[PDB]
Structure formats: C-alpha cells, structure tokens
Design a binder for this molecule. Sequence first.
Ligand SMILES: CC(=O)c1ccc(N2CCC(C(=O)c3cccc(Cl)c3)CC2)cc1
Ligand SMILES: *Cc1c(COP(=O)(O)O)cnc(C)c1O
Ligand SMILES: *Cc1c(COP(=O)(O)O)cnc(C)c1O
Lengths: 429, 429
Amino acid sequence: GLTPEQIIAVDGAHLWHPYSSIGREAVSPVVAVAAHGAWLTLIRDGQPIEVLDAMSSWWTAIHGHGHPALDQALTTQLRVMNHVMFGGLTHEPAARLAKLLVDITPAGLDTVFFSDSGSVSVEVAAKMALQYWRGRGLPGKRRLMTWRGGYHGDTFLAMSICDPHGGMHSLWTDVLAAQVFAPQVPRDYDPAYSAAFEAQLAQHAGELAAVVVEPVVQGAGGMRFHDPRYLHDLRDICRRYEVLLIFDEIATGFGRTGALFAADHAGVSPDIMCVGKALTGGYLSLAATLCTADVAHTISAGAAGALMHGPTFMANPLACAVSVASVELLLGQDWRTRITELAAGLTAGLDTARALPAVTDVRVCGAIGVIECDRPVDLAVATPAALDRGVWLRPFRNLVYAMPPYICTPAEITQITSAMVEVARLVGS
Amino acid sequence: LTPEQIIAVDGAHLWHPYSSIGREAVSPVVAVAAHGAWLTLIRDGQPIEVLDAMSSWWTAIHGHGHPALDQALTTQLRVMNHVMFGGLTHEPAARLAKLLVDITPAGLDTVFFSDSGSVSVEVAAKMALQYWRGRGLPGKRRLMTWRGGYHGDTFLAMSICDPHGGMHSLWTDVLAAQVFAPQVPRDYDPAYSAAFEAQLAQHAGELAAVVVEPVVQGAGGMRFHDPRYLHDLRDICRRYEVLLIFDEIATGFGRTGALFAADHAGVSPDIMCVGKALTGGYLSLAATLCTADVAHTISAGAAGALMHGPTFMANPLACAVSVASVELLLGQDWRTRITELAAGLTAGLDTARALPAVTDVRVCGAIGVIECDRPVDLAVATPAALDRGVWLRPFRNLVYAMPPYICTPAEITQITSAMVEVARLVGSL
Ligand SMILES: CC(=O)c1ccc(N2CCC(C(=O)c3cccc(Cl)c3)CC2)cc1
Ligand SMILES: *Cc1c(COP(=O)(O)O)cnc(C)c1O
Ligand SMILES: *Cc1c(COP(=O)(O)O)cnc(C)c1O
C-alpha cells in the first residue's frame, strides 16, 4: 500500500518515464488511481477526480478501460493457463488470434509472428525483409527506405527509420544505420511526389530490402495525414523495382482511421505488416508481424532455414486471449458507423479552433482529431486547463490532439473537443 | 477449437521461435492447461500431466497459477488495467520500483520499465551511450563482451551475442561491430582477466560499456564461470572508465542460488537488466536499472532525457503481478529452497557423468545441465521426456532444466531422471 504522496516521492526518486529525466522534470507526473470505461481517476490537489482519457492512453484503450468482455476474457484464460513457452508448444489463444488476424488484415498476409511490443515487431519485420533477400541470393538488398515524418519505435533499428528531427538523429552520429529518406509525404495527392519517390528509390533499389511507412496517418512524428493514393503508388513502385513494402499499422490498426486497417483506404496489401497498440484493447503489451506466404517460404527455404527471432513471452496466452476478445468485440458491432460518428463529432467540436489566432490547421481522420498551432504548446498551462474541464490531454510540440476511445458518447466528444479548443485558445494569449 | 484444429491453424499461420513455416521437423504439442509445476499437454488425442522442467523458458519460478499471483492480477484488473506512463504515475509502478531498487545490487537507484528483455538491453546500451555523450565523450560508443553470451534478438542486442551462437556470419554489414573477448573459462584463471584488461585497454576511448551475463551464460550455452571474474570486470571497468552492464534477464530472482548472480561476487554494475521471471512468468515485462550518477548525467546532457518510452511502459497489470511475484519470493526462505533444489539436481544428475555420450554435468542454483558429445535430436528427446512425464526442451548438445522453485524433492528427482534417460538415448541409436 502507498498513499499518492508516497507514490510521488518514490516516483521522483526512482521512476523513469517516457522520454523523461530523473530529477529535472518540469512538473510531477499525476497519480492515476483508477481507470474505467472512457475515464481515468487522477489525483489533483490530493483529491481524486474523474477525467476523460482523450488519448486512449497512447492509442491503446479503443474499447475503454475495464471493459467487462475483456476483463472476463483475461479472467477466463487466467484460470486455465497463464503462459507456456512457445518453443515446441502451441495453444488455443495463439491459434484463435492468428486465425482472426490473417482473416481481417489486407489480403495475402498469411503468417503471424507474435512479439511483445511494437518496436520489436518492427525489428522482426526488418529481419524478415533482410532474410527474404538473402534467401533470394541478394544480400546487398539490406537498407530501408522511408519518407520523412514517420515513427517506428525506440529500439535502435527502428530509430534508424524514424523522422531525423523527431528522432534527434543528430544526437546519434555514427550510431544508427544510415537509411534512405524521401521528403515529407504531402497531405494532398500530387503524382509528382510519387514520381520523385520512385526516382530516388530507383537508384537505391539494389541495396534496399524494403520501404517502411505508416499508412495514411503518421502518429508520433507529427499527426500528419496523407492521401491513401500515395500507398497505391508505393505498392506499384515497390513491385516494379523489387523492393518489399512494409506497413507499420501499430497506431493505425483496428478501425482507428475509419477503416479496419489504414491500408484498406488504399485497397493495397503490404508484403509485411506490423500491429500493436490497440491489439489487446489497451490491456497488455502485445504485437504481431505478418507477412505473405512468399516471404515466409523464401525465408524458410533460405540458407539459414529459419527466422532467427524468438521473444521469451512470444504468443503469451493471457495477452492473446484478451486480444481475441478485443478483436471480436470490434468486429461484433457496426464499428464503421461508430468511427464515422466519432469523426463527425470531432470535426464539429474542433471547427471553432480554425478561426483562433494561433491555429494553423485542424484535421480529422477517423477517431483522430488534431489542432496544429503556430508555436509550442506550453504543457504547464495546457494540462491544468484540460483537467479543470475533466479531460486528460497530452499535447506535444505544437499539436493539441486526441484519439478517444471508441465508446465515447457524443457528449464526451463535445467535452473532449471543447477542452482542446480552449487549450488552443490559451496558446494565443 | 480442438487440439487438431489448433494444429491445423498453427501449422498454417503461426511462426514459432527460431523456426520456419511449413518446414518444422516436429509439430508443436498443444498445451491446454498449466497449474503449479505441471503442464497439461495433448499427446495422441489425450491430455497428460508433465512437469515444466524448463519453467516455460525460465520464467515460471513460482509455478503456474499461483494463487498469490492470480489474485494480484485480478485485484489490479478491478481498479485499473493500464494508463499511459507519459505524464502519469501509479501505485504498482512505484511499489515495484521501490522493491527493485532495494533488492538489486547497491547503488542501482532508477528504473526504466519496458516490455521485453531485448528492449531492456537496448535501453541499457542507450543509457550508456547517452551517458558518455553527457560527459562530452561521444566517441565512447562501442560495446565489449566475452564470447558465449546472449542478450536478445533485436539488432543492437544481436551485436553482443556470441558471433557463432547468433550466426553473425549471417548478419555482417548489418550488425554494429563490437569488441569480443574470448570465452570466459569456468575455473578462475587470472591470466584471462589480464588479457581481458589488455584488450579493453586498446579500446577504452571508444567503449561505452562492458556488457555480460554474470556467472551463468544461458542461451549461448548454459556455461558457468567463477564469480571472481565479475570482481575483475568491476575493477577494470572502474580504472578505465567504462560502464559495466550486467544482463540478469535469465539469472535474476534467485535462479543461480543468490538473489541476483552479481551477489555471488558482491559486485554492483552501473546498469542492470532484468526480465524473464520478473512477473513470475505471467506477462511480458522487463526493467533496466542504472545508478543515480548515470541518470543525473543523462538528464543533464544535451537531450535532457533518456530517449526512450515504450507504449505499455510500466503496465499496471504486469507491474502488479511482478510486485506479488517478488514479494512472494522475498517472504519465504528462498535461499534454502534453491539450495535444496540444487542438491536434488546434483544428486539426481550425478549418474549421467558415466554415460558414454555425456561430457559434463554441472549444477548452479536451480539450473542443471548434461552436456553431451553431439547435438540432441529433439525428435528423440521430446517424446522420451514426455514418456517420463516431463516437459524438456534441449538445444544444441545440452539436456538441461530450470525447474520452478515450488518443485518438491520427488518432482526434481523425476526431472533429473527424465534428463538422465534422455541423455542415455543420445548415446544409443
Ligand atoms: C506511453 C506514453 O505515455 C508515451 C508518451 C510519449 C511518448 N513519446 C514522447 C515523444 C516521442 C517523439 O516525439 C519522437 C521520438 C523519436 C522519434 C520521433 Cl519521429 C518522435 C514519441 C514517444 C511515448 C509514449
Ligand atoms: C507506438 C508505435 C511503435 C512502437 O510501439 P512500442 O510498443 O512503443 O514499441 C511503432 N510504430 C508505430 C507507428 C507506433 O505508433
Ligand atoms: C531471455 C534473455 C533475453 C531476451 O529477453 P526477451 O524478453 O526474450 O527479449 C536477453 N538477455 C538474456 C541474458 C536472456 O536470458
């Protein structure tokens, strides 16, 4: 047992936080004491208050926290089998989830490699790509190409394809692998951009294993949207120059952008696909990398004879079982209508912010709404402002944005957007 | 799904650790339950109870379905499944960090949670690199280790795995080129330390850290070495200003007969990794610890923060079960328990020394190893162990067990007996 003041003291002395310091934090983290449905209970001024989880706890809690169908799924699997090692053994949660995932992902993705986090699945995807070409007799095809503004995780190979500014690649001189970056993909469809991308790829094609991109929505590198037709062009470019196509859908997966997977907006299939954040409905760390049969078999007929990867908790029965329920719960409802209503709620709620002086853009894609500002957002002001309106918001750089749980009612969206609009109002003054 | 349906889905759609698709010499065995030290597996259409001699890849130290860990999981499930750790903190993270800081080797004061051992190793290297950049020495960017080690499957972690065990021939031009000392011997030889120092001297100015598994090298070959090499590593790292990283992902939480294997030598590293048994084998979770000095130096450096933050960082569910797991270990007389486990393994395995295909028998804590004169054919060893009521997973030429701590004397003798028979069959044919 610990009181919130003891939690804060232990935290200050011993807990790293994401991209944080020890002992140089501008403001203490806020003690969370509960989380239920779309709502978190936080400690402000020593008192518990309920606020909306407008971030879905970093894209994860698509069905809300403590959903009874996913609680029960975890409690049911807990009674039979917490976990078994996946070396030499298999089980029902893994098979059911793999069945579900191959069926609902874009066509052609037939095999599923489970891991523990999104960064790992990305490295698994890269390893798949590199082993694929070795099994084709082309070990020179070993670099990655991407477009600027992306984000793919914090492990060192993943870092190498993150946006060089967002990723502070200047601080990693002579450390990261040197990958090929095309310019920032634009919002509106411009075929000249795809032509330029093709030309740059063409001169690297013989050393490129793969193109890796987030489809439609670029999350942590800047909450930028692009026309899905760009994905159509990458597919055709990759096919023509014999470079594999990897879609990182770790933030876009499972309905978040209006389609079940963002690749579906373009009607295109990658050779390799990563999923993660929402996979367990925000309960537990789990990820997966999927590839075509051709990739699977080429790796397996490779001289190495196998994919050299195997996380200790691979295909954890507890995380697979809740993920099964999370996916079935999503497919078991009219999810497409649900996201459309959420998008319309966000569009209506944030429209006020366009006319505000400090706002350069307001954009919505499925259950994602963004207010882009003309200067950094001072969190020391934005966080108390949103809390006083009962909304948990976490701006970064010049972005005030939300990815709310799918269960948010119209009133809760209106509360979330009103808080975002007000945060943007204070950016001016 | 039935076992047969699971088998069909699995063969079609699941990757397994370091495996192929559709080229598996053996099918996986369907596991349907796990309780205490026992797995329920399906063999010839029938369920059987077998001992989990591997502890499900060295994780299930308290056995499966321990009431204390089950309840800690359901209790946390009732209040809060997960919140984002960016901007927020919570009780299971604070308690777990206070626990780990208090029981790890002295001076390890800060805790970075992540979701797997591989990621925690990348976090450690990132800490070491950002540390020296904080000190104005950004040329200290390489790693040194001794051959025979294993540290995970992500690409930085791969770079310090044994260049044969990790098939580094298959990963040249891709992996960072690290500094490898020869295989550390089992008996203490002061000359090996002298040569290690001499090699490290020729690289000090480009070395960020020495990274080793302490006392026991797990996946690279279940090799033991004398603890006093860790004393020499500590002193050499001290005099040459190279940080010391201990990877205790396999050795932590009592496995080798001390709480952490570093304690066999009284040594404290600068950075420490833990993972496998951290949650008692329930959920994926890992932690990287470092000293106040490393943390304060990173935090005062150019980035002002450690450049890392996993989506599920400090997952309340995983942390809560780990709290229970660590407290359950601390609140019993674990040292006597592991001492008794080790005696049972030693007495039970002694008879294998005389088998013709056996080259060594060695025990260290709750770890027992029969080294054979040839690679062990899993198609012979697996059914033969299952015939004896034991789940065994040999690799390379090693028949070994890492049994759950709750194994009674008779269960240990049942485990060692199956291992002895497996080794007897190796020299038969
Ligand atoms: C779970 C949680 O609460 C959480 C909060 C924040 C968070 N970050 C912080 C900002 C980071 C960032 O901008 C960035 C870093 C490297 C490359 C690029 Cl392109 C962008 C991205 C991750 C991760 C997790
Ligand atoms: C969050 C994220 C990752 C990394 O996921 P982790 O589980 O934090 O490693 C990778 N790619 C994308 C697109 C993401 O949004
Ligand atoms: C098992 C292990 C790892 C990898 O942990 P994962 O969770 O499987 O990534 C790393 N280092 C050591 C010493 C290990 O035993």
